[PDB]
Design an enzyme around this catalytic site. Structure first.
Site, PDB file in Angstrom:
ATOM      1  N   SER A   2       0.942  -1.287  -0.211  1.00 32.42           N
ATOM      2  CA  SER A   2       0.071  -0.004  -0.164  1.00 32.42           C
ATOM      3  C   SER A   2       0.851   1.210   0.073  1.00 32.42           C
ATOM      4  CB  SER A   2      -1.029   0.143   1.087  1.00 32.42           C
ATOM      5  OG  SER A   2      -1.888   0.821   1.054  1.00 32.42           O
TER       6      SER A   2
ATOM      7  N   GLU B 121      -9.228  -4.886  -3.360  1.00 29.52           N
ATOM      8  CA  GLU B 121      -8.680  -3.905  -2.911  1.00 29.52           C
ATOM      9  C   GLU B 121      -9.429  -2.793  -2.123  1.00 29.52           C
ATOM     10  OE1 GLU B 121      -5.426  -3.909  -2.450  1.00 29.52           O
ATOM     11  OE2 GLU B 121      -4.402  -5.018  -4.120  1.00 29.52           O
TER      12      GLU B 121
ATOM     13  N   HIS C  57      -7.623  -5.934   0.993  1.00 31.42           N
ATOM     14  CA  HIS C  57      -6.582  -5.052   1.162  1.00 31.42           C
ATOM     15  C   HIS C  57      -5.485  -5.174   2.259  1.00 31.42           C
ATOM     16  CE1 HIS C  57      -4.111  -1.626  -0.269  1.00 31.42           C
ATOM     17  NE2 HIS C  57      -4.324  -0.678   1.230  1.00 31.42           N
TER      18      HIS C  57
HETATM   19  C1  LIG Z   1     -11.150   5.993   3.624  1.00 32.25           C
HETATM   20  O1  LIG Z   1     -10.260   6.795   4.604  1.00 32.25           O
HETATM   21  C2  LIG Z   1     -10.432   6.460   5.882  1.00 32.25           C
HETATM   22  C3  LIG Z   1     -10.006   5.362   6.682  1.00 32.25           C
HETATM   23  C4  LIG Z   1      -9.236   4.593   5.706  1.00 32.25           C
HETATM   24  O2  LIG Z   1      -8.491   4.851   4.689  1.00 32.25           O
HETATM   25  C5  LIG Z   1      -9.706   2.907   5.675  1.00 32.25           C
HETATM   26  C6  LIG Z   1      -9.573   2.468   7.149  1.00 32.25           C
HETATM   27  C7  LIG Z   1      -8.636   1.173   7.135  1.00 32.25           C
HETATM   28  C8  LIG Z   1      -7.954   1.059   6.230  1.00 32.25           C
HETATM   29  C9  LIG Z   1      -7.086  -0.226   6.187  1.00 32.25           C
HETATM   30  N1  LIG Z   1      -6.009  -0.352   7.267  1.00 32.25           N
HETATM   31  C10 LIG Z   1      -5.681  -1.424   7.227  1.00 32.25           C
HETATM   32  C11 LIG Z   1      -4.278  -1.379   6.569  1.00 32.25           C
HETATM   33  C12 LIG Z   1      -3.171  -0.918   7.330  1.00 32.25           C
HETATM   34  C13 LIG Z   1      -1.822  -0.965   6.358  1.00 32.25           C
HETATM   35  C14 LIG Z   1      -1.979  -1.442   5.137  1.00 32.25           C
HETATM   36  C15 LIG Z   1      -2.943  -2.120   4.614  1.00 32.25           C
HETATM   37  C16 LIG Z   1      -4.063  -2.028   5.259  1.00 32.25           C
HETATM   38  C17 LIG Z   1      -7.129  -0.083   8.458  1.00 32.25           C
HETATM   39  C18 LIG Z   1      -8.143   0.808   8.421  1.00 32.25           C
HETATM   40  C19 LIG Z   1     -10.142   5.354   7.915  1.00 32.25           C
HETATM   41  C20 LIG Z   1     -10.643   6.264   8.860  1.00 32.25           C
HETATM   42 CL1  LIG Z   1     -10.765   5.919  10.338  1.00 32.25          CL
HETATM   43  C21 LIG Z   1     -11.370   7.461   8.211  1.00 32.25           C
HETATM   44  N2  LIG Z   1     -11.830   8.719   8.923  1.00 32.25           N
HETATM   45  C22 LIG Z   1     -12.384   9.504   7.910  1.00 32.25           C
HETATM   46  C23 LIG Z   1     -11.954   8.854   6.598  1.00 32.25           C
HETATM   47  C24 LIG Z   1     -11.177   7.740   7.112  1.00 32.25           C
END
Ligand SMILES: COc1c(C(=O)CCC2CCN(Cc3ccccc3)CC2)cc(Cl)c2[nH]ccc12
Ligand SMILES: COc1c(C(=O)CCC2CCN(Cc3ccccc3)CC2)cc(Cl)c2[nH]ccc12
Ligand SMILES: *[C@@H]1O[C@H](CO)[C@@H](O)[C@H](O)[C@H]1NC(C)=O
Ligand SMILES: *[C@@H]1O[C@H](CO)[C@@H](O)[C@H](O)[C@H]1NC(C)=O
Ligand SMILES: *[C@@H]1O[C@H](CO)[C@@H](O)[C@H](O)[C@H]1NC(C)=O
Ligand SMILES: *[C@@H]1O[C@H](CO)[C@@H](O)[C@H](O)[C@H]1NC(C)=O
EC number: 3.1.1.7
Lengths: 532, 532
Positions: free
Chosen positions: A197, A324, A437
């Site tokens: 990522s 993904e 992902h």
């Molecule tokens: C869409 O934007 C967000 C997010 C995210 O980007 C997705 C959350 C997960 C994305 C994957 N993560 C696991 C992972 C870590 C390292 C490599 C691979 C996988 C865990 C959390 C989260 C939060 Cl809390 C948001 N709050 C506002 C907007 C927003």
């Protein structure tokens, strides 16, 4: 002895760890920079000043200061990604697993964690280097770097907060490996950087950056590439978000120096609380503080550098997972839930594509909608779910990566492409999320080799095959063993564009990974938005 | 006397023609207007002045002046569509087939020929009305109308060449049927107008035009609708083409009167010889002189009329053939040949879409190309051929009709929709052309009942089914006989959008005729072409 190593910066003492009814050496929490604290917040990293005596490298370091995910408390599917050590701005350390006994000049692999550039730790259970280091007899390093505003606050023109310092942390750790890894039994002329990522993007950014090219031999990119839409911003946008970060915290905004002085006065968590408030749009798969195209770490735009062949010429091995996008729909799009099938109404689909492609005009949103809607069956909640899933995945990971692979292969010295689509038998996430992902990572680090982790026998075999591919590639530039009765992973070429599935079944070769959708994302949509 | 009939315009004497081991009455070449000759070229038609004595209506009239297709000399496949009578501007006649003995007050069907508004004849072999008139016991009329510049030269503002006079010719023939058909055993209250291609667009234009609505009961549209992209032009464009016609003939262009006077002095063939040179672009399925949106025959834009329900509310029965486009690729697009499979290279495919969608900008061309290209297999000559086939048919015929049918059904009193996909056993065209534009006509008119024509027994059965659908619809507004045992052709409804296949197999019901592509042609592309 074997656990006592003298490095150019001082002595470090490792510890003997078990690994699958055997043992190897581990040097944990080795400092590679000066703590970037106080007046050094937002600043380029300084090399760690030498210490007298013996550094206790027996335990994992602190994790960098970051947003912590509390969406699903106690839930291992989300918490396995959270910092599992104390958070501190004093976090620039690296870890090293050395096979026992210590080899002479062996292949080195350096892991760079992902996490959207706003999070991530080198110390997560799935990044435990011992299995891959042992099994494949390589010297395995995991570095760390500043994330969020601490790593990527960009006020271009200022030397106090230039931007990209998180990438410079990574570079400094690489430079450290270059200088010291020989003392651990590693060949500094055969280092492979690899990451997932944001980490994968990172690996490609070091391929592009002149200042990083001489610090590694080849690169592995998992589910990320330097040109991903979430992976960089312009100097203007970096500055906008930096200023807006000030506004949110009632800072003086008259000048960079005043803005920076104010931001340096705030407790770390104060910054994090407002981090997400600086995004220009309601969005998913968008992160506030990310690398800036600054004209220094990156000489010019990423596209022109890829076009002109201005980048490190070597072997790359890279790929994506089948689904993904699902993780990000779960966290930010209406109708999705961890605890249901998440059949998506038509209304929630429309809302979804708008969140997914925040920067498109109405015509662009219509184009995307048309491209992923079956109009014989538009009220099919499942098809709507999977379509949104495909949209997020294709646009943020898969097609940006395919754009990179096609540009890189014109100039590179060897490309190997994969499509990871095994759904682990022990996954705690719901079925609809598919091959998520990040979930090829446990296979690359050989976690399935661990009995108590309750993987299947065929999953262990897959992990081993994947580890051997990765390690063998790192050693020679070719995932295939020259001997071998076993089937061969073909070169990706400009004409034939071959790739392989990675799963528990016998290897198949395909061509043109998602070419239909990626023509849309890479050629037509960009032209549409620019024209309108 | 059965063959002797006194009309409001004068007496008329018919002929007794054999039909399938029986006989019926034919009245051929009855005049319904003054010869649009001399100073009446381009002018609105005038009613035929009453005559003394008896008009011999025992032979077909002359065909209107028109381009003659000489692409394939001697070839029945193209020549069956050319004038089979001497051409003359004195061509406004109609034909009538009457069951023997004369019906008291029976259903009337009035045929309007197609030919892109630039060609066509009421006297073609395939329009021979005796089989349908005899078999279904209906009074069948075939009218005629001026085509090309003679029928549709438009200089809006001028009362000498107003435009749409060919549609007014049609109207005048309809008004004649309204006034006189009762003398032939027909009910002027139960007249169905039906026509194919240009004829089908015509029919729809009479549905829309206030001046026409009360001159018929119901309507059948075959492979054409009023809103087709080739079927009309703006007053501005119609003017440009009229003026360009003069320029191609060294005419005084200073005024309408001078221009018109110059054009009225030319032999018909001189006009025709340069007809095609006035088109705006290199194109296929585009014709020079067509209906103008004038504010008189059409009060406002076709789209706004369809939107507001401004049109005749009645029953309609309409449909399309499987490969509407193929005829036109043959004549205009590179790589197509009557005597080969016409596998289309990628370069010729590109050339074809540009010819097929001549108004599109570059963004639009890219859109079309993307929507019809399999990017896993873009050099497949077959998929490229068929792709271009679909492009021409979807854009020009199928999706215009689907838009019409959807708009109309929201206000109308019953809609029946068909998809004709039978390739005739005795077709003279190559297999790649498939189910060709125009080739359901021989079934509607019962040619397969003629054993010497060598159609299969199941093709005769299909023809009889189709003639009964058309005629039963004409009589009752429903192609089905309730209380009958056979499969029922269901109403097209806004919600379910059902339609049937017409072919030699047991009936199938489908829904949403080519929705995916027609959403592209009807919603997305026009939005894209309108933005800049
Ligand atoms: C869409 O934007 C967000 C997010 C995210 O980007 C997705 C959350 C997960 C994305 C994957 N993560 C696991 C992972 C870590 C390292 C490599 C691979 C996988 C865990 C959390 C989260 C939060 Cl809390 C948001 N709050 C506002 C907007 C927003
Ligand atoms: C010679 O014609 C053309 C065209 C055409 O569009 C020809 C295609 C027709 C050829 C015969 N038609 C048969 C038919 C008639 C009634 C109902 C159904 C089918 C229909 C398609 C275009 C251009 Cl740009 C031309 N330029 C010169 C000459 C010419
Ligand atoms: C290193 O630290 C651990 C605990 O943090 C401790 O148990 C160990 O004894 C230390 N090593 C030395 C040499 O003091
Ligand atoms: C890599 O470089 C060598 C030497 O320049 C060349 O012979 C070889 O073909 C290259 N391999 C690829 C896969 O481009
Ligand atoms: C009408 O025309 C036909 C065909 O030429 C001819 O045989 C017939 O004698 C004509 N009838 C009269 C009354 O002139
Ligand atoms: C047609 O109109 C009649 C007259 O009101 C009405 O009774 C009937 O329901 C309508 N049928 C359809 C199919 O709309």
């Amino acid at each position: 002895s074997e656990l006592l190593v003298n490095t150019k910066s001082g002595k470090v003492m490792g510890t003997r760890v078990p690994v699958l009814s055997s043992h190897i050496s581990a040097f944990l929490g080795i400092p590679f920079a000066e703590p970037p604290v106080g007046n050094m917040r937002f600043r380029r990293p300084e090399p760690k000043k030498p210490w007298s005596g013996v550094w206790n490298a027996s335990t994992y370091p602190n994790n960098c200061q970051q947003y912590v995910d509390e969406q699903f408390p106690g839930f291992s599917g989300s918490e396995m990604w959270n910092p599992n050590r104390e958070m501190s701005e004093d976090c620039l350390y690296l870890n090293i697993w050395v096979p026992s006994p210590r080899p002479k000049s062996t292949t080195v692999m350096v892991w760079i964690y992902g996490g959207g550039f706003y999070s991530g730790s080198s110390t997560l259970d799935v990044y435990n280097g011992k299995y891959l280091a042992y099994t494949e007899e390589v010297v395995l390093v995991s570095l760390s770097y500043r994330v969020g505003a601490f790593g990527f606050l960009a006020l271009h023109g200022s030397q106090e907060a230039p931007g990209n310092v998180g990438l410079l942390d990574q570079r400094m750790a690489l430079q450290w490996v270059h200088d010291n890894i020989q003392f651990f039994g590693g060949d500094p002329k055969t280092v492979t950087i690899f990451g997932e990522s944001a980490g994968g993007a990172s690996v490609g950014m070091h391929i592009l950056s002149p200042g990083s090219r001489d610090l590694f031999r080849r690169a592995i990119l998992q589910s990320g590439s330097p040109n991903c839409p979430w992976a960089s911003v312009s100097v203007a946008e970096g500055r906008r978000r930096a200023v807006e970060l000030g506004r949110n915290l009632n800072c003086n905004l008259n000048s960079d120096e005043e803005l920076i002085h104010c931001l340096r006065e705030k407790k770390p968590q104060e910054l994090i609380d407002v981090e997400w408030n600086v995004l220009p749009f309601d969005s998913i798969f968008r992160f506030s503080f990310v690398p800036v195209i600054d004209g220094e770490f990156f000489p010019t735009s990423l596209e022109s550098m890829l076009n002109s062949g201005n980048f490190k010429k070597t072997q790359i091995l890279l790929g994506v997972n089948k689904d993904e996008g699902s993780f990000f729909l779960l966290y930010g799009a209406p109708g999705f839930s961890k605890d249901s099938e998440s059949k998506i109404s038509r209304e929630d689909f429309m809302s979804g594509v708008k969140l997914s492609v925040p920067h498109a005009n109405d015509l662009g949103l219509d184009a995307v909608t048309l491209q992923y809607t079956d109009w014989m069956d538009d009220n099919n909640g499942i098809k709507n779910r999977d379509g949104l899933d495909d949209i997020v995945g294709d646009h943020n990971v898969i097609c940006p990566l395919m754009h990179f692979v096609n540009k890189y292969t014109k100039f590179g010295n060897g490309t190997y492409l994969y499509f990871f689509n095994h759904r682990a038998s022990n996954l705690v996430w719901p079925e609809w999320m598919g091959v998520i992902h990040g979930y090829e990572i446990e296979f690359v680090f050989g976690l399935p080799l661990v009995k108590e982790l309750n993987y299947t026998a065929e999953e262990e075999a897959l992990s081993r095959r994947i580890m051997h591919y990765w390690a063998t590639f790192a050693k020679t530039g070719n995932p295939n063993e020259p001997h071998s009765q076993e089937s061969k992973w073909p070169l990706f070429t400009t004409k034939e564009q071959k790739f392989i599935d990675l799963n528990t079944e016998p290897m198949k070769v395909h061509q043109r990974l998602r070419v239909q959708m990626c023509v849309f994302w890479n050629q037509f949509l960009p032209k549409l938005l620019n024209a309108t």
